[PDB]
């Protein structure tokens, strides 16, 4: 209910190191719990071995689709979707974690990490944590993306959990 979360990242199977996130449990406890417990894999499934399937330079890294690995899947610890908890935290800076969705109250497991302020998403996507180590890895992954979001290397979460 409070430990920071890590992802180890590889790019075409080359380990690039660890990203660490602080989650905003005091602002969005239900959303933060979902991401943390998908990272620990405590329910038997989650982010370990998943990929970032859509990476757009000067915008964000999108991942978390551990069922279909293409944006059409993912599921939360509460079921296939759960409500938007609130929108109090805004997309003010690089390195923010926020939930991807398919309209109101369709949160599952997919998330993005911003590389710029994305204020136009305020009030529509729930922001729930921030990178505190490894923003350099985020920028390296970002460079493997493209305007369409297609990556030119496989970006994998090889391990994840709490620190």
């Amino acid at each position: 209910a409070m430990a920071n979360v890590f992802f180890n990242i590889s790019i075409n199977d080359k380990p690039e190191g660890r990203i660490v996130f602080k989650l905003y449990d005091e602002a969005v406890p239900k959303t933060a719990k979902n991401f943390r417990e998908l990272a620990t894999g405590q329910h038997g499934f989650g982010y370990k071995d998943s990929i970032f399937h859509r990476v757009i330079p000067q915008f964000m890294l999108q991942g978390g689709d551990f069922t279909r690995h293409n944006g059409t899947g993912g599921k939360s610890i509460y079921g296939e979707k759960f409500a938007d908890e609130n929108f109090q935290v805004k997309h003010t800076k690089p390195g923010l974690l926020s939930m991807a969705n398919a309209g109101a109250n369709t949160n599952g497991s997919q998330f993005f990490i911003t590389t710029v302020p994305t204020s136009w998403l305020d009030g529509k996507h729930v922001v729930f944590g921030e990178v505190i180590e490894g923003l350099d890895i985020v920028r390296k992954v970002e460079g493997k993306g493209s305007a369409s979001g297609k990556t030119n290397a496989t970006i994998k979460i090889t391990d994840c959990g709490t620190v």
Binding site: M60, Q62, T72, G74, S98, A100, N101, A102, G108
Partner: peptide, 11 residues
């Protein structure tokens, strides 16, 4: 445009 959608990807 700049969107983060789960399956209907929009401009």
């Amino acid at each position: 445009x700049l969107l983060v959608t789960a399956g209907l990807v929009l401009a």
